[PDB]
Design a protein around this nucleic acid. Structure first.
Ligand SMILES: [Cu+]
Ligand SMILES: [K+]
Ligand SMILES: [K+]
Ligand SMILES: [K+]
Ligand SMILES: [K+]
Ligand SMILES: [K+]
Ligand SMILES: [K+]
Ligand SMILES: [K+]
Ligand SMILES: [K+]
Ligand SMILES: [K+]
Ligand SMILES: [K+]
Ligand SMILES: [K+]
Ligand SMILES: [K+]
Ligand SMILES: [K+]
Ligand SMILES: [K+]
Ligand SMILES: [K+]
Ligand SMILES: [K+]
Ligand SMILES: [K+]
Ligand SMILES: [K+]
Ligand SMILES: [K+]
Ligand SMILES: [K+]
Ligand SMILES: [K+]
Ligand SMILES: [K+]
Ligand SMILES: [K+]
Ligand SMILES: [K+]
Ligand SMILES: [K+]
Ligand SMILES: [K+]
Ligand SMILES: [Mg+2]
Ligand SMILES: [Mg+2]
Ligand SMILES: [Mg+2]
Ligand SMILES: [Mg+2]
Ligand SMILES: [Mg+2]
Ligand SMILES: [Mg+2]
Ligand SMILES: [Mg+2]
Ligand SMILES: [Mg+2]
Ligand SMILES: [Mg+2]
Ligand SMILES: [Mg+2]
Ligand SMILES: [Mg+2]
Ligand SMILES: [Mg+2]
Ligand SMILES: [Mg+2]
Ligand SMILES: [Mg+2]
Ligand SMILES: [Mg+2]
Ligand SMILES: [Mg+2]
Ligand SMILES: [Mg+2]
Ligand SMILES: [Mg+2]
Ligand SMILES: [Mg+2]
Ligand SMILES: [Mg+2]
Ligand SMILES: [Mg+2]
Ligand SMILES: [Mg+2]
Ligand SMILES: [Mg+2]
Ligand SMILES: [Mg+2]
Ligand SMILES: [Mg+2]
Ligand SMILES: [Mg+2]
Ligand SMILES: [Mg+2]
Ligand SMILES: [Mg+2]
Ligand SMILES: [Mg+2]
Ligand SMILES: [Mg+2]
Ligand SMILES: [Mg+2]
Ligand SMILES: [Mg+2]
Ligand SMILES: [Mg+2]
Ligand SMILES: [Mg+2]
Ligand SMILES: [Mg+2]
Lengths: 81, 79, 205, 86
RNA sequence: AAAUUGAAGAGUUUGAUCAUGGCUCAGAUUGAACGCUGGCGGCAGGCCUAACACAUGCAAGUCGAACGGUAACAGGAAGCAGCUUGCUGCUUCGCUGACGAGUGGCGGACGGGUGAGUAAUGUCUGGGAAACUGCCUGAUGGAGGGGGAUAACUACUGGAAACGGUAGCUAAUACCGCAUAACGUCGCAAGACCAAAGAGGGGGACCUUAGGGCCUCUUGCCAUCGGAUGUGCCCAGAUGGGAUUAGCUAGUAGGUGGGGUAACGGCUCACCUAGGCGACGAUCCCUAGCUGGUCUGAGAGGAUGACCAGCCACACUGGAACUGAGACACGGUCCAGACUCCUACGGGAGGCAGCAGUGGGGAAUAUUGCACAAUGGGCGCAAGCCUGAUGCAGCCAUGCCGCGUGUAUGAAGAAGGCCUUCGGGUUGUAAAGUACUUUCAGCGGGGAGGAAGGGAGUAAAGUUAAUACCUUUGCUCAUUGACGUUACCCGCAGAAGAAGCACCGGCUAACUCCGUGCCAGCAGCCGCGGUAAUACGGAGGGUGCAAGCGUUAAUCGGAAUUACUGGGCGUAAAGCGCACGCAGGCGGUUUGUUAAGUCAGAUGUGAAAUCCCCGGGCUCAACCUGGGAACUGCAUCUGAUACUGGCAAGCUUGA
């Protein structure tokens, strides 16, 4: 089904995830429907380490998309500003 | 509205069918000269009204035979 | 990855003093600067236009201690950057950390400043940087490390620096052994004996 | 087969094939009865055969042996042919 | 703001010249290879050939919260006994934690590989109608009452094995009726017809047997209509070469009717019409996966399609269907074929273009590694299990980028080498010597981040008959890292462990001596070598690059040398021997109209990545990354009407 998850990009030992909506069958770094944010797990201080389009995420959830556990945790952290 | 083409009947010997030639005027991609191109379509003509030489009016529809996917709307001009 | 041969042969080939020595003595008293090196050095070199362009480029390279691949990359960056390409190339060369240290006076020569940078004795904005090709931004602070403040060669370089012209785009305090890179040097602040348009034309051949 | 689940899938699919084949034959036999009645020209017999046919194709479509569209096609075609028998 | 800062020539035909014209060179680039040489690190890349054949290990399972059950082992329960005084060992019970085999569900159509085939069946861009769609999601309603089997198992039995055979027993969310039947199907209507499954947690009055239908909650099942996603189908334009391939086609083109598909359709069949395609290149032949992009180029173009991502096709070869929401299915089924293997000779087994690896071919391309810690996927309520995807590690200078191989001083201008008009010059501040620092490598110590979560408790809230269960939100407690001896930081020692390759007549930066004597040899071209060779070979000196440097192959450039931008044809190559003329291209002048070309604006689309601009993070850079710009196109709508086209009416200067 349609899901919201992380595609791993970046370099070796320095991951950088793109938060994307995709048919869950596609490969992790493959075909996706719409990019809705990003998450840098090694972001330096004073640097934006997470950004999500909560309106688009809510729209897709209302359309029936599921959410991966890491993306759910990221949404919780973003909402808890 | 509906997308629609206009052309000239080049054959009407089929039962309820006609061949319509559509002319386009396009710039040559390399030399820049405007040239004429022709596309021939098989068109469904119920009542067999159209004749060879008439300027006719066609629209796109569902497939009706192996080569027919267009149908006649009206006759703009009669030969 | 670094020229390690005799230093005065380069200046003799280029026909001018490249400041490859500290300056305690005279280049004429140390070498036959007016004569090109080698057995046939007394011959009068008829140089073609390509030869003139090449010698100018090699002179700039030998002054700043940059190898060919890095220098070509500098030229590409200078051409990409807006404005006058030759002036951009000169500004990029002057922005190097080893050159900035030498101009600030912590090193007697550019090679000595490069060794000081490499051996982790130089700090930029409070962080240790040991990359000789590091680009120094405006308002940056270049300071000598505390464990290296006791080095006698640093004091010798500092007492040799004021014997030369003071760079107006830097602000150096020798008591604390630290300087500020106020702004990028203009073309006027650099030597007039460098014809960068020759290098620019050479890289279009 | 090299994978245990593949072996089990083969066994299950063969059993499913036998089941499906018997049901498909039964449905086809009833449809053929309707068509033969239409061919004979007996409208009453054709209607009777159609009445016996209709629940069978409906139940098979519900069970998934055929599609609802196929059951509807059979019913529509046979109704159209029966209504012209008058 | 910014995101088009962009364009070099040289040699060679002649005694000399100008032109023409080919050939050759300087540049950039690569999945490269070879020769010589080789210190470190980061990021990436690595069978281009045989879609050749493959040893071995691994690459797809999971669910006991669907079901009958108990092969284990772990308890609980009964007896006996060495008993060592209640610790042990052996039997009986699925009673529990669980679980081998079996039934059932879901997954195995994903993820991964390869480019054989394919020249439009595909791909790209833009449209479209006659369709289905598991898991996810919204709404409205249902979930009643029965039945017959079957695996496992037991007994016997065939066979070397693979694989079976006979009889008997049993369960379900396996299967099949009956009931119910309307925003569903058929039908103008009246009418006719179609479905389902339970499981789990807790519980008082436990309404009845300590369980359950008694209540509640969770989850699951069925029907219909939607959403979302995925898939099937249709049309137009674009997408290689060949005319020393010009005709091709009978299901062929269309029509009617029947059948068929989820769906339109010659998809198929019967009949009727005699059509359909093609110089705007049909048919035939050769080559080829397509795109985003990549290399080159000032641009226009030219070449190209490895890695990354989208699309397609294939899975030992040929063919076929079955199951299924989805396959005509890489690690499924059946048949045939070639190879390999087992056999008791009757008969059986197999498919690395998954990861690693072997043989083979080749100029040439790596380890039979670690872990599911992170991201993602399958199953599961969850815990968790599975995952050669993936994250990492190993090998290789294959590429890009960074750094080091020391710094300062030092005339005795030391020795030695080389040249010398013998005065000297050069190697050369070079070395030695003298003062210094210690990046990297080596040794010792410290030490991030990739970790989110999950598990136990608690308190509150929501539910319900219930302070029970369950869910949610907080708080508390112990924990989860393959990489890994991580990055990084600190300390010790001592310049100590670290430079080569090509070239030096001109193009082209860099010159002499000796050896040889059209020999040996060099060479991209011009050419060099004949006894005073800056061209062969050595040496000294020098030049250019540098952990690389050269050579070979290959593409674009220079080549305005296929010229659209941007060339020529009297004599250099080039005007048909001369005409008439179809198609085609082109069209004097005025008015009106149209709005096709053209122009303006808007909207949708033009995937992401890549390129460019402005920024951010790795000490810098390569690299990673935010936003923009761009994607120069297509379609639609609304406008403009000068020019071109269409239509109508003219005019006389062309005819
Ligand atoms: Cu046998
Ligand atoms: K038709
Ligand atoms: K510039
Ligand atoms: K199973
Ligand atoms: K010649
Ligand atoms: K020439
Ligand atoms: K000649
Ligand atoms: K002459
Ligand atoms: K399946
Ligand atoms: K291919
Ligand atoms: K039932
Ligand atoms: K219950
Ligand atoms: K229920
Ligand atoms: K056909
Ligand atoms: K037909
Ligand atoms: K038909
Ligand atoms: K280009
Ligand atoms: K292209
Ligand atoms: K095949
Ligand atoms: K697959
Ligand atoms: K995992
Ligand atoms: K000497
Ligand atoms: K809690
Ligand atoms: K001689
Ligand atoms: K031209
Ligand atoms: K228009
Ligand atoms: K007009
Ligand atoms: Mg380098
Ligand atoms: Mg078999
Ligand atoms: Mg001559
Ligand atoms: Mg291959
Ligand atoms: Mg396994
Ligand atoms: Mg089990
Ligand atoms: Mg069932
Ligand atoms: Mg019923
Ligand atoms: Mg191509
Ligand atoms: Mg069709
Ligand atoms: Mg091929
Ligand atoms: Mg050009
Ligand atoms: Mg490819
Ligand atoms: Mg094979
Ligand atoms: Mg089926
Ligand atoms: Mg297939
Ligand atoms: Mg399969
Ligand atoms: Mg296989
Ligand atoms: Mg392999
Ligand atoms: Mg070989
Ligand atoms: Mg170290
Ligand atoms: Mg953290
Ligand atoms: Mg020269
Ligand atoms: Mg000689
Ligand atoms: Mg020589
Ligand atoms: Mg050209
Ligand atoms: Mg010419
Ligand atoms: Mg002649
Ligand atoms: Mg001639
Ligand atoms: Mg003539
Ligand atoms: Mg004529
Ligand atoms: Mg005109
Ligand atoms: Mg894009
Ligand atoms: Mg934009
Ligand atoms: Mg007009």
């Amino acid at each position: 089904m349609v899901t919201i998850r992380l595609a791993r990009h970046g370099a070796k030992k320095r991951p950088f995830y793109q938060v994307v909506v995709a048919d869950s069958r596609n490969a992790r770094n493959g075909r996706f429907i719409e990019r809705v944010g990003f998450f840098n797990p090694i972001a330096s201080e004073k640097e934006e380490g997470t950004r999500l389009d909560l309106d688009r995420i809510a729209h897709w959830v209302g359309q029936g998309a599921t959410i991966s556990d890491r993306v759910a945790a990221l949404i919780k952290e973003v909402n808890k500003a | 509205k509906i997308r629609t083409l206009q052309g000239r009947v080049v054959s009407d010997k089929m039962e309820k069918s006609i061949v319509v030639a559509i002319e386009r005027f396009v710039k040559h991609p390399i030399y820049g000269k405007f040239i004429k191109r022709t596309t021939k379509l098989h068109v469904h003509d119920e009542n067999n009204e159209c004749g060879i030489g008439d300027v006719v009016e066609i629209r796109e529809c569902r497939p009706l035979s192996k080569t027919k996917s267009w149908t006649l709307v009206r006759v703009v001009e009669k030969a | 990855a670094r020229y390690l041969g005799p230093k005065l042969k380069l200046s003799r080939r280029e026909g001018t003093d490249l400041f490859l020595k500290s300056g305690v003595r005279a280049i004429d008293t140390k070498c036959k600067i007016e004569q090109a090196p080698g057995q046939h050095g007394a011959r009068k070199p008829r140089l073609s236009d390509y030869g003139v362009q090449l010698r100018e480029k090699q002179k700039v390279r030998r002054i700043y201690g940059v190898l060919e691949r890095q220098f070509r990359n500098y030229y590409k960056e200078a051409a990409r950057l807006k404005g006058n390409t030759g002036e951009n190339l000169l500004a990029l060369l002057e922005g190097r950390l080893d050159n900035v240290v030498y101009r600030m006076g912590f090193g007697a020569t550019r090679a000595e400043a490069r060794q000081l940078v490499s051996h982790k004795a130089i700090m930029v904005n409070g962080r240790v940087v040991n990359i000789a090709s590091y680009q120094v931004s405006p308002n940056d602070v270049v300071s000598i490390r505390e464990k290296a403040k006791k080095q006698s060669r640093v004091k010798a370089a500092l007492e040799l620096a004021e014997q030369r012209e003071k760079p107006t785009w830097l602000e150096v305090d020798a008591g604390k052994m630290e300087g500020t890179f106020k702004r990028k040097p203009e073309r006027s602040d650099l030597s007039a004996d460098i014809n960068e348009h020759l290098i620019v034309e050479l890289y279009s051949k | 087969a090299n994978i245990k689940s593949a072996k089990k899938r083969a066994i299950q699919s063969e059993k499913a094939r036998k089941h499906n084949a018997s049901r498909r034959s039964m449905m086809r036999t009833f449809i053929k009865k309707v068509y033969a009645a239409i061919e004979a020209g007996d409208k009453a017999a054709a209607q009777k055969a159609f009445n016996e046919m209709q629940p069978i194709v409906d139940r098979q479509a519900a069970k998934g042996l055929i599609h609802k569209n196929k059951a509807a096609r059979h019913k529509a075609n046979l109704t159209a042919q029966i209504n012209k028998l008058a």
